[PDB]
Amino acid sequence: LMHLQYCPQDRLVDVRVPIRLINDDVAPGVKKGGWISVKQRLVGYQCRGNSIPPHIEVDAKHLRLDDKVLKRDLPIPKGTRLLGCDFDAVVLHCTTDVGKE
Amino acid sequence: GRAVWRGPYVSVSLLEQVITFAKRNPEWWNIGRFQGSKAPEAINTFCRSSTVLPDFLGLKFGVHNGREFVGVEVQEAMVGHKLGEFSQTTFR
Amino acid sequence: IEEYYVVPPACPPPPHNPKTLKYVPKLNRTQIIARVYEAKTPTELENSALGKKFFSEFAAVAKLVRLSQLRRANVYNSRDDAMCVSIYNTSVRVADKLLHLSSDEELCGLIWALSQLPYPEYENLVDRSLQILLEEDKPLKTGSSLAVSR
Amino acid sequence: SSLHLTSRYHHMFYNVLYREMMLKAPKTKVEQGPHLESITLTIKTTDTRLDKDIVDKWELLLFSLALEHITGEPAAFLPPPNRHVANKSAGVTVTLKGEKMFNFLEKLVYTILPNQTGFEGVPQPKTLVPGPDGVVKRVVDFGVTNLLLYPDFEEHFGVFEPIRSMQVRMMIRSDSDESCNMLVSGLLVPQLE
Amino acid sequence: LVRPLTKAMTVVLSNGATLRLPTVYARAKPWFPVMDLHSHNVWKHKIKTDFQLESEKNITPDFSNFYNKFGK
């Protein structure tokens, strides 16, 4: 079953936008031996019908070990605003832990 | 103890050590010592029988105990006593 | 045996995050006054200006002036009478706190509105307005005859 | 009527101190500001000459009488630690609010505390677990180690000789710990920091 | 179960001011505390003037309080 919403160009909709990474290979943390862990694949946004971001581009070219990117640091394109109040939530984390498995 | 009307005892060698220290650090001696800054260096001595002066306030003394120089920083409450009362020679 | 509590830290909104994507235009004093006067029922008059940003000294005077016109021109039931009483009680109390900021025209209108309305007069609103206008220079310099006539 | 029926501190708090706190710490609502709710006075067995955790009530009557003189209101025995023990208690307590609370604070600060040897400041407040109402409260605790400084225990000294010490707790409602300190300073109680 | 009657007593401070405070008993003679808020050093305001600040900044050594016990 497929659920769709009637979305004119002048309506406000809530969209869970995926998070994408750029320049992950070129990063001090990766070179040292760490990896970038994504804690929230999707983030909530309120967007207009005419401007829905296909994805959020987060640059990690200048991240070292123990660097964390929170919701406050996410880009906010034109015509959209962040939803909710649970800011200061970890989205990206450059670490070396592998879950202690 | 020593008769009060005859004054204290202080060794001449101890006084010479302090005078040299003052010349080396004129700024701390005149100003810094009273704001609360710690002494830039310590003075080692064998004069365990000398009385502690309040002009020795903020000074750091290394008092010989037979093996090494035990650090002693002068406080107001230590005034009037001998340097040898704050450097122990026996250990249990 | 007594546990202790840690207050969670506050959540400051991030910068450059619009509070709303809707179109809410800014309102000046002139627009608020026009909105207040363009009211047909006590409920509309009550909701014409609410909040400490819009319910200022000038808004309180406008509500009293418009309330007098509606009371004289229309007959109301019990529910609308209660709405009118609420409007009068709140507007006067606001005036009693921001009286010193009122202008000459506002004070002239306030006296006229208070005389027409039948509810009990507030503490000394009329006397205070008279004292401010008793210098005898404001009435002489009142260019608008409407304020003098009122 | 030549009787003490007024409260100096009560007038000071509402007519003088309250406005000053508002200017220092602006808040949206008038009632949003520091407030002193109650003061609790407790005497336990560990603060008396008696050496036992659980003692009979007839041995604690003297201490209960002492609190009555200090506070002017009758005190109550602490509840028994368990149902099995019925006639034995573990101390006495009294709670004050309103004008009586302010009068006790005035006398303590002006006369008794300055005459206590080892006093520098009251400790920092501690935050308790919010109750069902969801209100956060802070408590400031300190003790008085010389109860024979009051001018009331001189009429019959031999009776009041065993009185040694007392504990005091104050409950404050405020938005933050800094606000609690501001209120305490307004009360003329130095805080140890 | 019956609260006692509270009377008033006059307390004189170091500055000569008088205060009426509650008391269970009655005392005809004013009571003089050994120490009060004004006399105690803890209850002192920390507001200092420019003159006081200048005095603290500019201080030269003063060795009198020790070596006087010698000259006598």
Residues contacting D148, CB < 8 A, separation 6+:
D160, D163
Rg (CA), chain E: 23
Contact A81 C18 (CB under 8 A): yes
Contact C14 A80 (CB under 8 A): no
Residues contacting D4, CB < 8 A, separation 6+:
D103, E6, E7, E8, E20, E21, E22, E23
Chains C and D form CB pairs within 8 A to the count of: 14
Q: How many CB atoms lie within 10 A of CB D117?
A: 6
Pairwise CA distance, residues D128 & B74, whole Å:
44
Distance from CA of C32 to the nearest CA of A (A): 28
User: Are D40 and D169 spatial neighbours (Cβ–Cβ below 8 Å)?
Assistant: yes
* Backbone φ, ψ for residue E10 (5° rounding): -95, 130
Pairwise CA distance, residues B41 & B21, whole Å:
9
C3 burial level (CB within 10 Å; 0-12, 13-18, 19+): exposed
- Pairing of β D166-173 and β D35-44: antiparallel
Which of B34, B50, B56 should we substitute to test contact with E (largest number of E Cβ atoms within 10 Å)? Answer: B34
| E6 DSSP 8-state letter | P
CA distances from C139 to C112, C127, C133, E6 (A): 15, 16, 7, 62
CA distances from A87 to A72, A84, A94, C2, D18 (A): 7, 8, 19, 32, 36
Pairwise CA distance, residues C53 & B65, whole Å:
79
Written as six digits, the tokens of D54 are: 């659980």
Q: What sign has the CA pseudo-torsion D61, D67, D71, D76?
A: negative
D133: three-class secondary structure by DSSP: coil
Q: Are there at least 3 beta-carbon pairs closer than 8 Å between D and C?
A: yes
Distance from CA of A26 to the nearest CA of C (A): 29
Greatest Cα pair distance in chain A: 50
Closest Cβ–Cβ partner in E59, E60, E66 for B53: E66
End-to-end CA distance of chain E: 68
Q: Could you tell me if A10 lies within 8 Å of chain C, comparing CB atoms?
A: no
Q: What sign has the CA pseudo-torsion D8, D9, D15, D17?
A: positive
Written as six digits, the tokens of D78 are: 């602490």
Order of strands across the sheet that contains A12-22: A56-59, A12-22, A42-48, A80-82
Looking at beta carbons, which residues of chain E come within 8 Å of B31?
59
Partners of chain E (3+ Cβ pairs below 8 A):
B, D
DSSP for B65-89, please give it: -SSSEEEEE--GGGTTSBGGGGS--
* Backbone φ, ψ for residue B85 (5° rounding): -80, -15
Closest Cβ–Cβ partner in D74, D107, D188 for E21: D107
- Amino acid, res. E70: F
User: Are E23 and E7 spatial neighbours (Cβ–Cβ below 8 Å)?
Assistant: yes
Written as six digits, the tokens of D106 are: 């005035």
What is the dihedral angle through the alpha carbons of B5, B6, B10, B11, rounded to the nearest 10 degrees? Answer: 180
Q: At CB < 8 A and 24+ separation, what contacts does B67-71 make?
A: B69/B42, B69/B44, B69/B45, B71/B42
Written as six digits, the tokens of D133 are: 């109402």
Q: Are there at least 3 beta-carbon pairs closer than 8 Å between B and D?
A: no
Pairwise CA distance, residues D46 & D55, whole Å:
11
Distance from CA of B78 to the nearest CA of E (A): 12
Name the method of structure determination. cryo-EM
DSSP for B1-17, please give it: ---GGG-----HHHHHH
Contact A80 C21 (CB under 8 A): yes
Pairwise CA distance, residues A17 & B33, whole Å:
64
Written as six digits, the tokens of C88 are: 């009068």
Which of C21, C22, C23, C24 should we substitute to test contact with A (largest number of A Cβ atoms within 10 Å)? Answer: C21
Tally of CA atoms within 13 A in the half-sphere of E58 that contains its CB: 5
Give the helix ranges, DSSP H, for C117-150: 125-132, 138-141, 145-149
D169: three-class secondary structure by DSSP: strand
Q: Could you tell me if D120 lies within 8 Å of chain E, comparing CB atoms?
A: yes
Pairwise CA distance, residues D50 & D61, whole Å:
13
Residue of chain C minimizing CA distance to D125: C4
User: Are C67 and C101 spatial neighbours (Cβ–Cβ below 8 Å)?
Assistant: no
Q: Which of D184, D98, D179, D172 is nearest to D135 (CA)?
A: D172
Q: Could you tell me if D130 lies within 8 Å of chain C, comparing CB atoms?
A: yes
CA distances from C27 to A81, C52, C53 (A): 24, 14, 10
Pairwise CA distance, residues A78 & E25, whole Å:
78
Q: D191 has which bridge partners?
A: D122
- Pairing of β B60-64 and β B43-45: parallel
- Amino acid, res. E53: L
Written as six digits, the tokens of B49 are: 């029988």
Q: Are there at least 3 beta-carbon pairs closer than 8 Å between B and C?
A: no
- Pairing of β D88-89 and β B69-73: unpaired
Written as six digits, the tokens of D96 are: 């004050």
Pairwise CA distance, residues A55 & D164, whole Å:
73
Which of D127, D135, D167, D178 should we substitute to test contact with C (largest number of C Cβ atoms within 10 Å)? Answer: D127
Contact A12 C16 (CB under 8 A): no
Q: Could you tell me if C21 lies within 8 Å of chain A, comparing CB atoms?
A: yes
Nominal resolution (angstroms) = 3.2
Task: Give, in degrees to the nearest 5, the angle at Cα C36 between C33 and C41.
Answer: 165
| D166 DSSP 8-state letter | E
Residues contacting C43, CB < 8 A, separation 6+:
C80, C83
> CA C126: distance to chain centroid?
16
Pairwise CA distance, residues D57 & D79, whole Å:
11
Written as six digits, the tokens of D119 are: 């006093």
- Percent helix, strand, coil in chain D (nearest 5)? 35, 20, 45
Q: Could you tell me if C4 lies within 8 Å of chain D, comparing CB atoms?
A: yes
Pairwise CA distance, residues B61 & A94, whole Å:
51
Q: B63 has which bridge partners?
A: B45, B70
Distance from CA of D53 to the nearest CA of E (A): 26
